[PDB]
C-alpha cells in the first residue's frame, strides 16, 4: 500500500496533525492523509470490520478495548526506551487483555474552575461549600453551578470515598463486580443530594445553564474540563483552574480519557505507522505542531507535558487526571452509565432515596453487563449458523438427474417454440436489452412483449462463472437452500475478493458522477451483461485465510468441483421470473387497495408497513400516520389495512421461499419473539416501498436486513428506455419483464436502478419488500414497556388528545402536547433499551445485522 491514512475527530488540531504528515513524506517519501469524518465513533468499527479504513485511528481510549476484543486494532510493540517517554498511567489505558493496542497522545479529566474575583481562595474540600454558599447567596451569587444531568460530572464525588464502575484486576475489568452500592459510593451521592435539598444546588442544573451562570460571573465555581476553557477566555471572567476538592479527605476521582493512536489490523502499513508515531508524532515539536492548530490540553509525553504543565490549567488537569480513575475500556460501560444517570436523576429530584436509587442501578447495571455479553455469544451462533441439512453425496447425484433430465425438457420445448420466452417476452442473450415494449390488451398487468434497442451482450466479468455441471449445480442447491425452476436457470460463482473491490469501484463511480448516474456509472453499466428473462442465482465464495465472516470451524461438505475446495458459499443475489397468474394478481391488487385507500405514506419514495416514525411525537404504535387514522377514524373494519399488509408481505413472501428455502430460515434466525409482532405477517418484512417510474443512484444499503425482496409490474401499455436495476459487482443488470423478483444482500451487494425514459402511458412500478431494524426494536421496546396489544388503545388516546389541544387551543398547543408524549415514549424506549429489549439479533460490533448467513465450507482431500 505504501501510505498512511489517519482518522481523527473535527473537533481536534488535525492541520496540525497534516503539517506533522508532511515532514514525513520528506525523509521516507510516505504520503500522509488526514480525513475528519461525521459520525466517527461508529464509523471505524462499522468499515474496520471488513477490513477496510485508515492506518492510525485517533479516539478516547475507552472505544479501543471494544476495537480489540473484534480484532480491529494492531498489537503495538514500542520499546522500553520509548515506554519510559510517557507517563505510565497512559500506557495502561491503552492495555486490553496483556496487550498494548493504541500510541497515548492527551490525558483529560475534569477540574474546579473558579472566579478569582469572586473567591481568591477555592475550597480545599467539598464540606465548605455548604458554609461557602451561604456567604455568596447575601451577596446576590451561588457557590457552584456543575452539570448534573449526566453522571460524568457527578462521579467525581461519588467514586472519592469508594465507588467504582466495574472491579480491575490481574489486567482485566470484573463485569459480575460493580461499584455502585458500597457505603463510598452513598456517602458521596448522600452529600451532593443534601446540597440539592439545603438549596446550595438546584437538580435542574444542566451544562448550558451551569456555563452561562459562570460565564456570565453569577456562580463562584463550575466543574468542567479543558475543552471549556475556550469559551471562557471569550468572557469577562479572571478564572483559575485548581484541584476538585476533597471529600471526607479523599481527593474526587474524575474519570480519565486518553486520546489515542490506534493501528488498523488491516494496515498493510503497520511498521511505517510505528515509525510515523514514536519518532514524528510522540515528540516535542511533534505534539507543538499539533498544539498549535488545537491545544490537546494535557499530553502523555513527560518532555513535553513538563513545558505544557508552565500553564496552571493543564497542571491541574493532569493532578486532578492522576488523583482519577482510568475510564474503562469495555463496552458494558454503557450499562453503567444509563443505571446510575437514572440513580442520580431520581436521587437528586427526589423519586427515589439515596440508598434506594444507587441499589436498582447497582443491580441494573450488573444485569445489562451480563445479558450484552450474554448476547454477543449468541450473536456468534447466529453468525455461523447452518441450514437444516439436504446436501449429501447421493443426493445432489440425485438431484444433478432431474436437472439434467429438466434441461433436455427445456431445450425440447425451446426447439419446438422456435426460442427461449419468459412470459411472451422472446428471450436472447446474445442481445443486451436496452428498451422494451409492454402491452395491455386488459385490466390485468401489462406484459412485456418486444425487445426495442439492443447492443450485443456484453461477456460475464472474469471474477463472475457461469456454473456448467449439473453436480456443480446440484451440490449448491442443497447446500445453500436454493430451488430454481428445473432446467431453466443459471447459477454463477464469484470470487468474494474481486466482488468487494467492484463494490468500492461502484461507490467511486458513482461519487465521481456527483451522488446521480452519470459518466462514470454508464461506463460500468457498458460492461454489465443482460440477463433480461433469466432466473439466476450468484455464490460468493470466500477463500479459507474480509467484509464477509464465514466459519471455517463448521461442518465440511465435499464438493463435485475441486475449484471450491478450501473456500466458503454463501448466496448474494437471485433472479426470479414469477409466471403470471394467482400470487401476482393478489399481490399487484393489494398495492392498488394500499394506493387507493391512502396509505402510501411519502418521504421520492412511497412507503407502508409497520414503521415507528419517531419525528411524530404522537406516534405510539405500528405504522405511518396514516395508518395510526385508519384504524380509528374507519366506519367499517379498524383492522382492514393491516389484513391487507400481511396479504402483501406473505403472498410475497410465499413466491419467493418455494424457491428459496433460507429465506424463513433467516427469518426464523434474526427474528426475535419480541420483533415477530411487529413484522409483516410470518415474514422478515415490516416496510414495503413503491416507486413510479423511478431510478436509483448505485449505493449500499446500512440498517436492513441481511436479504432484501424487490419486485415490479407495469400498468399501461407502452415502451420503456433505461430504468435497468444493475448490479455492477456481479457484471450484470436486467429489465424487469411481466414480473420479476430479485432477492438480494443489500448491505453488502451495490445496487440500481437506471433513469427511465417512457413512450405511452406505461408505468411501472418498483417495491422493495425489507427490514428496517430501528422501527422493529422500537417496537419491540414500546411492547415491553407498554404491552403489545396496548398499543392501539395509546394510540387512540394520544390522537386523541392532540386533536383536542388542536381544537380548543391552536397548532401550538398541539404540538406541545406531541412533544410531552414523544419525551415519555422516548422515557419508555430508552429503559427497555437498557434492558437488552430486541427486536432483532444484532452484532454488537457493528450495530447491524451479520453481512450474510448460512456459509458452507467445501474441502475436499485427497
Ligand atoms: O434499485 C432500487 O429500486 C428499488 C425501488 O424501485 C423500490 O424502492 C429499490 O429498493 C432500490 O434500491
Ligand atoms: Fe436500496
Given at each position: ?19 506533522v ?35 492510525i ?7 479501543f ?5 473484534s ?43 473558579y ?7 477555592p ?24 452539570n ?82 475556550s ?6 471572567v ?31 502499513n ?41 500553564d ?35 436521587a ?56 439434467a ?46 425487445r ?46 474481486a ?18 448516474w ?17 432466473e ?29 475446495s ?19 394478481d ?8 394500499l ?11 412511497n ?109 399501461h ?19 424487469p ?18 433513469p ?76 427497555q ?30
Amino acid at each position: 500500500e505504501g501510505k498512511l491514512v489517519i482518522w481523527i475527530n473535527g473537533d481536534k488540531g488535525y492541520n496540525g496533525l497534516a503539517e506533522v504528515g508532511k515532514k514525513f513524506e520528506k525523509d521516507t517519501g510516505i504520503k500522509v492523509t488526514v480525513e475528519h469524518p461525521d459520525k466517527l465513533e461508529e464509523k471505524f468499527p462499522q468499515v474496520a470490520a471488513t477490513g477496510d479504513g485508515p492506518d492510525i485511528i485517533f479516539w478516547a481510549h475507552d472505544r479501543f478495548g471494544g476495537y480489540a476484543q473484534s480484532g480491529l486494532l494492531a498489537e503495538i510493540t514500542p520499546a522500553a526506551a520509548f515506554q519510559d517517554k510517557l507517563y505510565p498511567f497512559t500506557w495502561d489505558a491503552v492495555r486490553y487483555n496483556g496487550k498494548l493496542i493504541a500510541y497515548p497522545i492527551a490525558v483529560e479529566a475534569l477540574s474546579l474552575i473558579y472566579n478569582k474575583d469572586l473567591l481568591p481562595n477555592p475550597p480545599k474540600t467539598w464540606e465548605e461549600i455548604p458554609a461557602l454558599d451561604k456567604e455568596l447567596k447575601a451577596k446576590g451569587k451561588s457557590a457552584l453551578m456543575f452539570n448534573l444531568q449526566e453522571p460524568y460530572f457527578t462521579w467525581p464525588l461519588i467514586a472519592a470515598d469508594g465507588g467504582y464502575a466495574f472491579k480491575y484486576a490481574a489486567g482485566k475489568y470484573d463485569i459480575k463486580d460493580v461499584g455502585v452500592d458500597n457505603a463510598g459510593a452513598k456517602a458521596g451521592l448522600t452529600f451532593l443530594v443534601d446540597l440539592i435539598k439545603n438549596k446550595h444546588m438546584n437538580a435542574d442544573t444542566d451544562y448550558s445553564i451551569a456555563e452561562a451562570a459562570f460565564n456570565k460571573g453569577e456562580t463562584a465555581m463550575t466543574i468542567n474540563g479543558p475543552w471549556a476553557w475556550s469559551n471562557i477566555d471569550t468572557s469577562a471572567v479572571n478564572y483559575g483552574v485548581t484541584v476538585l476538592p476533597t471529600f471526607k479527605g479523599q481527593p474526587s476521582k474524575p474519570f480519565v480519557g486518553v486520546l489515542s493512536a490506534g493501528i488498523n489490523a488491516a494496515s498493510p502499513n503497520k511498521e511505517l505507522a510505528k515509525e510515523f508515531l514514536e519518532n514524528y508524532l510522540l515528540t516535542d515539536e511533534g505534539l507543538e505542531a499539533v498544539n498549535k492548530d488545537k491545544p490537546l490540553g494535557a499530553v502523555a509525553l513527560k518532555s513535553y507535558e513538563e513545558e505544557l504543565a508552565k500553564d496552571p490549567r493543564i497542571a491541574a488537569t493532569m493532578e486532578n487526571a492522576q488523583k482519577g480513575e482510568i475510564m474503562p475500556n469495555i463496552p458494558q460501560m454503557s450499562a453503567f452509565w444509563y443505571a446510575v444517570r437514572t440513580a442520580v436523576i431520581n436521587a437528586a429530584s427526589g423519586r427515589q432515596t439515596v440508598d434506594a436509587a444507587l441499589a436498582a442501578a447497582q443491580t441494573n447495571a450488573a444485569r445489562a453487563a451480563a445479558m450484552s455479553v450474554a448476547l454477543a455469544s449468541e450473536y456468534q451462533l447466529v453468525q455461523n449458523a447452518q441450514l437444516p441439512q439436504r446436501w449429501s453425496q447421493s443426493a445432489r447425484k440425485s438431484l444433478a438427474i432431474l436437472e439434467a433430465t429438466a434441461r433436455k425438457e427445456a431445450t425440447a420445448q425451446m426447439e419446438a417454440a422456435g426460442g427461449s420466452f419468459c412470459g411472451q417476452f422472446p428471450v436472447d442473450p446474445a442481445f443486451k436489452v436496452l428498451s422494451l415494449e409492454y402491452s395491455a390488451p386488459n385490466p390485468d398487468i401489462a406484459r412485456a412483449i418486444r425487445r426495442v434497442d439492443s447492443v450485443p451482450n456484453p461477456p460475464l466479468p472474469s471474477h463472475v462463472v457461469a456454473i456448467q455441471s449439473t453436480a456443480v449445480d446440484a451440490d449448491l442447491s442443497l447446500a445453500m437452500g436454493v430451488s430454481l425452476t428445473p432446467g431453466r436457470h443459471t447459477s454463477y460463482l464469484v470470487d468474494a475478493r474481486a466482488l468487494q473491490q467492484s463494490n468500492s469501484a461502484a461507490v467511486a463511480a458513482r461519487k465521481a458522477d456527483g451522488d446521480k448516474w452519470g459518466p462514470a456509472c454508464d461506463e460500468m453499466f457498458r460492461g454489465c451483461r443482460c440477463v433480461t428473462g433469466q432466473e439466476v442465482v450468484f455464490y460468493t465464495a470466500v477463500k479459507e485465510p474480509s467484509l464477509f465472516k464465514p466459519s471455517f470451524d463448521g461442518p465440511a461438505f465435499r464438493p463435485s468441483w475441486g475449484e471450491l475446495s478450501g473456500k466458503a458459499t454463501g448466496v448474494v443475489a437471485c433472479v426470479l421470473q414469477v409466471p403470471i397468474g394467482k400470487e401476482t394478481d393478489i399481490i399487484c391488487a393489494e398495492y392498488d387497495n394500499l394506493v387507493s385507500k391512502g396509505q402510501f405514506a411519502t418521504v421520492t419514495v412511497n412507503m407502508t408497513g409497520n414503521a415507528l416514525i419517531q419525528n411524530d411525537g404522537k406516534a405510539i404504535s405500528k405504522g405511518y400516520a396514516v395508518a395510526h387514522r385508519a384504524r380509528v377514524t374507519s366506519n367499517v373494519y379498524g383492522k382492514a389495512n393491516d389484513v391487507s399488509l400481511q396479504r402483501l408481505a406473505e403472498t410475497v413472501w410465499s413466491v419467493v421461499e418455494k424457491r428459496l428455502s433460507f429465506m424463513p430460515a433467516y427469518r426464523d434466525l434474526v427474528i426475535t419473539e419480541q420483533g415477530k409482532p411487529f413484522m409483516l405477517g410470518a415474514t422478515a418484512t415490516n416496510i414495503i416501498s413503491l416507486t413510479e417510474n423511478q431510478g436509483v443512484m448505485l449505493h449500499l444499503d446500512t440498517d436492513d436486513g441481511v436479504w432484501t425482496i424487490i419486485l415490479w409490474f407495469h400498468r399501461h401499455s407502452g415502451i420503456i428506455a433505461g430504468g435497468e436495476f444493475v448490479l455492477p459487482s456481479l457484471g450484470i443488470s436486467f429489465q424487469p419483464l411481466d414480473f420479476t423478483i430479485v432477492v438480494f444482500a443489500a448491505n453488502t451487494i451495490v445496487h440500481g436502478t437506471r433513469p427511465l425514459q417512457t413512450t405511452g402511458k406505461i408505468i411501472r412500478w418498483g417495491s422493495s419488500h425489507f427490514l428496517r431494524f430501528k422501527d422493529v426494536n422500537a417496537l419491540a421496546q414500546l411492547g415491553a414497556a407498554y404491552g403489545v396489544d396496548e398499543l392501539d388503545a395509546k394510540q387512540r388516546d394520544q390522537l386523541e388528545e392532540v386533536d383536542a389541544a388542536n381544537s380548543k387551543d391552536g397548532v401550538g398547543a398541539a404540538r406541545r402536547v406531541a412533544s410531552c408524549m414523544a419525551a415519555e415514549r422516548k422515557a419508555a424506549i430508552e429503559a427497555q433499551k437498557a434492558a437488552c429489549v430486541r427486536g432483532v439479533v444484532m452484532n454488537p460490533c457493528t450495530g447491524r445485522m451479520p453481512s450474510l448467513l448460512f456459509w458452507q465450507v467445501w474441502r475436499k482431500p485427497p
